[PDB]
Amino acid sequence: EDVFEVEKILDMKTEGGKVLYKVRWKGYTSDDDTWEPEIHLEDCKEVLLEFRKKIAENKA
């Protein structure tokens, strides 16, 4: 799957019991954002951490 540079995670959701992340690819516009299965980002901890924060500081 070629593999591409990840800029950040935009949001998350669950489809059934599985976790998915909407990804913003570095160098690409939002027209290229895709929902990816969690396992695809597990080794992108800098990115996962920055998303956990963004959501914690927004929790109303």
Partner: peptide, 12 residues
């Protein structure tokens, strides 16, 4: 040593 920074794209 820094994280992967990359990921595969199945969503294409």
């Amino acid at each position: 040593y820094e994280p992967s920074t990359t990921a595969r794209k199945v969503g294409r």
